[PDB]
Amino acid sequence: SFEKTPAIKIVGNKFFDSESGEQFFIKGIAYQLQRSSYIDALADPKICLRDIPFLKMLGVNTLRVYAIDPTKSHDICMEALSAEGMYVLLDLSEPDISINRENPSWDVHIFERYKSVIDAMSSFPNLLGYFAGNEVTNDHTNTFASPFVKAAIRDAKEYISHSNHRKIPVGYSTNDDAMTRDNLARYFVCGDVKADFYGINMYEWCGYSTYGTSGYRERTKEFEGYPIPVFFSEFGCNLVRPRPFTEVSALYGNKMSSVWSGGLAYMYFEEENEYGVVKINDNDGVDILPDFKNLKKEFAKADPKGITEEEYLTSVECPHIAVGVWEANEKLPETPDRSKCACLDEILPCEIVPGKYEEYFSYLCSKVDCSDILANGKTGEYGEFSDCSVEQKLSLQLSKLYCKIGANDRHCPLNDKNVYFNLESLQPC
Ligand SMILES: OC[C@H]1O[C@@H](O[C@@H]2[C@@H](O)[C@H](O[C@@H]3[C@@H](O)[C@H](n4cc(COCc5cccs5)nn4)O[C@H](CO)[C@H]3O)O[C@H](CO)[C@H]2O)[C@H](O)[C@@H](O)[C@@H]1O
Ligand SMILES: OC[C@H]1O[C@@H](O[C@@H]2[C@@H](O)[C@H](O[C@@H]3[C@@H](O)[C@H](O)O[C@H](CO)[C@H]3O)O[C@H](CO)[C@H]2O)[C@H](O)[C@@H](O)[C@@H]1O
């Protein structure tokens, strides 16, 4: 039963409860355990059922989860959250399978990860939304990563659209770099592809600050009339401790509640970073920390004045390119084609099984033309096989070199144990 969590839907720039028609405001906390690769607390009933009672005491209605294991079951924890009126915002990526801001790609490997998460989690009515990226572009030196994230948003939305699932919204979580924030916000709603919602990881309010002095007033004026729901995907500057969380009073007050859809505190678990509200002891029990009571008290006082769906019902230009400032082309990479790329596994004479990549690409791309695997988010030029996996891309170039030599003797021209001649290439997509 998910009776206590009706699906949330988006209308204009606001969230609404699909049954009652009341505006939904996020009162959230980040919930993600790390090791001393990722840990999936929502796949382990003994963990999630320990913490839900404490999450209930805090008075949250939403969790942000950064990584799940899509091969494991999540119905016990998701149903337990639903029984306390709690929703989940979920990142599709994980640390080892993400759009790399230093060398961005949108490819079959990352897209399959996103699809796997979507197929694991879309059956739950309390899945609020998916993030297609988190702080990919984070300063003026890597703005060319953003077209790859926009392609990911497009393709995740289309995959969801063509599935039998509820049309769960797909958005983006960004940082708060002064030089890039306005351009990033405009970019993710420009042209033909738009984020469904926009989260900012917001740490401007430290200690006993105010609406005016924190920067919250200027941020609120910047985002007034923004066409999609906007919220703080993280908050909780820890400069002054114990964190009073007085930003919460501002966030759900009358000035900010007309613009923002709430926010999520960072975070539940203490992990030697002074950001937790509880610490898990050596006996796996929950020790409440000094921040807990302040967040609890602040969420309890928060009473956002929203508007109902009925009374509410009653193309934007992409930022121009400027060298060293904004370098994200409007033109996006194509949808990764799993079948086309899988055909390379069948037909290529020379293959490589998954430091080595940099050396091998450097070597092979001085002997053959690697344009067909290059992807340039600045110029909007995306090679024909730039959507394939890194090993497929490498295999293509090795095979091109093999055919260029033309010895035709099954000896692939690269000395490495991972290289092998593909016997399927001989069998006459
Ligand atoms: O796509 C951009 C990058 O993604 C990276 O993986 C990503 C990973 O780094 C990120 O880590 C999160 C991490 O960034 C986040 N976190 C939050 C904070 C608080 O920051 C306080 C501040 C300090 C200074 C100013 S504000 N610090 N870390 O905590 C989360 C839960 O513990 C973590 O999941 O979680 C993502 C989702 O799963 C992965 O997509 C990849 O590893 C990179 O290669 C890639 O470039
Ligand atoms: O500079 C790049 C860096 O920006 C970070 O966001 C900053 C905020 O950290 C900063 O926050 C506070 C001040 O606005 C406020 O007046 O005082 C407190 C200290 O008492 C500051 O911490 O404000 C600036 C400007 O609005 C923000 O850009 C991002 O979080 C980070 O991702 C980025 O790397």
- CA–chain centroid gap for 156, Å, is 11
Pocket lining: 238 vs ligand 1, CB cutoff 6 Å: no
Say whether 135 is catalytic: yes
Residue pair 235/266 in contact (Cβ under 8 Å)? The answer is yes
Resolution in A: 1.7
Q: Where are the alpha helices (DSSP H) in 173-286?
A: 181-187, 211-214, 216-222, 247-251, 254-257
Three-class SS of residue 81?
helix
Characterize the bridge pairing of strands 8-11 and 262-265: unpaired
Say whether 102 is catalytic: no
Q: How far apart are CA 227 and CA 328, in angstroms?
A: 21
> Which residue(s) pair with 129 in the sheet?
89
Residue 162 phi/psi, 5-degree rounding, is: -80, -15
- Domains annotated for the chain, with CATH where assigned, are 8-314 (3.20.20.80)
Q: How far is the CA of 95 from the centre of ligand 1 (A)?
A: 8
Neighbour count for residue 104 (Cβ, 10 Å)? 22
Two tokens, residue 274: 């002074």
With 0-12 CB in 10 A as exposed, 13-18 as middle and 19+ as buried, what is 239?
exposed
Q: Where are the alpha helices (DSSP H) in 181-333?
A: 181-187, 211-214, 216-222, 247-251, 254-257, 291-301, 309-313
Pocket test for ligand 1, best of 38, 65, 91, 93 (most atoms within 8 A of CB): 93
Q: Looking at residue 224, what DSSP letter applies? A: T
Which residues neighbour 323 within 8 Å (Cβ) at sequence distance 6 or greater? Answer: none
Q: Locate tokens 């709603």: which residue?
A: 189
Q: How far apart are CA 60 and CA 47, in angstroms?
A: 18
Q: How far apart are CA 378 and CA 148, in angstroms?
A: 11
Q: How was this structure determined?
A: X-ray
Which residue's alpha carbon is at the smallest distance from atom 45 of ligand 1? 100
Which residues neighbour 103 within 8 Å (Cβ) at sequence distance 6 or greater? Answer: none
Q: How far apart are CA 202 and CA 289, in angstroms?
A: 22
Angle at 13 between CA 12 and CA 17, to 5 degrees: 80
Two tokens, residue 156: 């995740």
Give helix 146-162 / helix 108-121 axis angle, nearest 10°. Answer: 40
Which residue's alpha carbon is at the smallest distance from atom 2 of ligand 1? 136
